[PDB]
């Protein structure tokens, strides 16, 4: 009872291996759960182009993801999107908000992704995703997500101006050291839930770090969130921004950690 959708088209990517990382994550889920992914979009090379150029280039991929996600959300399965970049969610979050006006979106990211055309310093579309879905600027793929229904989880070291856009819009922020499973449950209340994860939320490293306090979220904290959200309330999950080359040992190790984090929710949906 899992629908797997995989973006393989460029959506503003500035990193070299996020399309490959999405493909490898999808393969691991196919093998573990006996699934066959629906792959959407054609790869293209990364570039440092302005959002106003990258966004129109991505239209075909974004429309195709929108159509696949809509069909899955209207059905009876768990919708799982394995996305190259967070910017794919410019297509999906408006669908979630329209079909589930009461949903809470847990936007789990080391960043706020809440810049607008006026406030971006780098021009990167990936830094403008949640603000676009909430209608602070027009992505051309809709809006309609209430900022009051969006919760940034794990975000830290946010620029002062962006943090004030977040505050004024009403988006809640739960930093890593507050992001226990219960803190997240308290924020969701009785709502159905959509989980979006950018892996840059995670504390760097895989070695033991028992005597220092982490700056990012630990894998165990993400797993605890997936364990705590009731299966009956979970609409879908997006896994984004694994930068790891195809056929690398690094990608193999990274996807094993991902499977451990998501297993509580995916196991429940499968059975
Ligand atoms: Mg469903
Ligand atoms: Mn992001
Ligand atoms: Mn991020």
CA of 126 to the centre of ligand 2 (A): 6
Question: Which experiment gave this structure?
Answer: X-ray
Local structure of residue 175 (DSSP, 8 states): -
Q: Which of 134, 107, 127, 139 is nearest to 238 (CA)?
A: 107
CA of 230 to the centre of ligand 1 (A): 13
CA of 201 to the centre of ligand 3 (A): 6
Measure the CA–CA gap between 224 and 233, rounded to whole angstroms.
Answer: 16
Measure the CA–CA gap between 223 and 229, rounded to whole angstroms.
Answer: 10
Measure the CA–CA gap between 158 and 150, rounded to whole angstroms.
Answer: 16
Locate the domains of the chain by residue range. 1-271
Measure the CA–CA gap between 104 and 97, rounded to whole angstroms.
Answer: 9
CA of 127 to the centre of ligand 2 (A): 6
SS3 60: helix
CA of 232 to the centre of ligand 1 (A): 9
Measure the CA–CA gap between 111 and 219, rounded to whole angstroms.
Answer: 17
Q: Which residues surround ligand 2, an ion (CB under 5 A)?
A: 86, 109, 113, 198
Q: Is 190 annotated as a binding residue?
A: no
Q: Are strands 104-108 and 193-198 parallel, antiparallel or unpaired?
A: parallel
Measure the CA–CA gap between 3 and 33, rounded to whole angstroms.
Answer: 11
SS3 151: strand
Cβ proximity of 198 and 111 under 8 Å: yes
Centre a 10 Å sphere on the Cβ of residue 198 and count the other Cβ atoms it contains: 25
Q: Say how far residue 207 (Cα) sits from the centre of its chain.
A: 25
Q: Is 109 annotated as a binding residue?
A: yes
Which value in Å is the resolution of this experimental model? Answer: 1.3
Q: Which of 83, 89, 81 is nearest to 105 (CA)?
A: 89
Pinpoint the alpha helices (H) of the chain.
18-33, 51-57, 59-74, 89-99, 129-133, 160-169, 181-188, 219-228, 249-270
Ligand nearest to the CA of 155: 3
Measure the CA–CA gap between 123 and 128, rounded to whole angstroms.
Answer: 9
Q: Which residues surround ligand 3, an ion (CB under 5 A)?
A: 109-111, 198, 200
Q: Is 198 annotated as a binding residue?
A: yes
CA of 159 to the centre of ligand 3 (A): 13
H/E stretch holding 4: strand 2-7
Phi and psi at residue 262, to the nearest 5°: -85, -15
SS3 237: strand
User: What sign for the dihedral angle of Cα 255, 152, 15, 60?
Assistant: positive
Tell me the CA distances in angstroms from 142 to 90, 167, 246, one per residue in order.
8, 22, 33
Tell me the CA distances in angstroms from 192 to 49, 87, 99, 182, 269, one per residue in order.
36, 22, 11, 16, 15
Residues 209/172/193/126 CA torsion (nearest 10 deg): -70
Ligand nearest to the CA of 107: 2
Q: Which of 189, 257, 201 is nearest to 229 (CA)?
A: 189
Ligand nearest to the CA of 237: 1
CA of 235 to the centre of ligand 1 (A): 5
Cβ proximity of 247 and 256 under 8 Å: no
Q: Which of 223, 225, 237 is nearest to 270 (CA)?
A: 237
Phi and psi at residue 18, to the nearest 5°: -80, -30
Q: Is 102 annotated as a binding residue?
A: no
What is Dmax (Cα atoms) for the chain? 48
Q: How many CA atoms lie within 13 A of 29 on its CB side?
A: 30
CA of 266 to the centre of ligand 1 (A): 12
Q: Is 157 annotated as a binding residue?
A: no
């Amino acid at each position: 009872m899992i629908d797997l959708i995989v973006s393989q088209g460029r959506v503003a990517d500035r990193a070299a291996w996020m399309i490959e990382g999405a493909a490898r994550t999808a393969r691991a889920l196919e093998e573990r759960y006996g699934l066959k992914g629906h792959y959407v979009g054609e790869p293209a090379p990364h570039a440092d182009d302005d959002w106003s150029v990258a966004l129109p280039q991505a239209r075909e991929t974004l429309v195709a993801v929108r159509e696949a996600a809509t069909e899955s959300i209207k059905g009876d399965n768990l919708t799982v999107l394995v996305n190259n970049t967070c910017s794919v969610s410019l297509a999906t979050l408006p669908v979630v908000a329209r079909e589930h006006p009461d949903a809470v979106v847990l936007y789990i990211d080391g960043h706020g992704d809440f810049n607008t055309p006026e406030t971006t310093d780098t021009g990167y579309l990936g830094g403008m995703v949640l603000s676009g879905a909430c209608g602070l600027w027009d992505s051309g793929h809709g809006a309609g997500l209430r900022p009051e229904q969006a919760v940034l989880v794990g975000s830290r070291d946010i620029d002062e101006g962006e943090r004030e856009l977040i505050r004024k819009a009403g988006v809640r922020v739960i930093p890593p050291g507050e992001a226990t499973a219960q803190a997240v449950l308290d924020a969701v209340k009785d709502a159905p839930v959509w989980i979006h994860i950018d892996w840059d939320v995670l504390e760097p490293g895989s070695i033991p770090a028992d005597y220092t306090v982490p700056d990012g979220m630990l894998p165990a904290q993400i797993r605890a969130v997936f364990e705590a959200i009731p299966a009956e309330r979970l609409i879908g999950v997006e896994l984004a921004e694994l930068n790891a080359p195809a056929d690398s040992e690094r990608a193999e190790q990274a996807v094993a950690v991902i499977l451990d984090m998501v297993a509580p929710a995916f196991d429940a949906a499968a059975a």
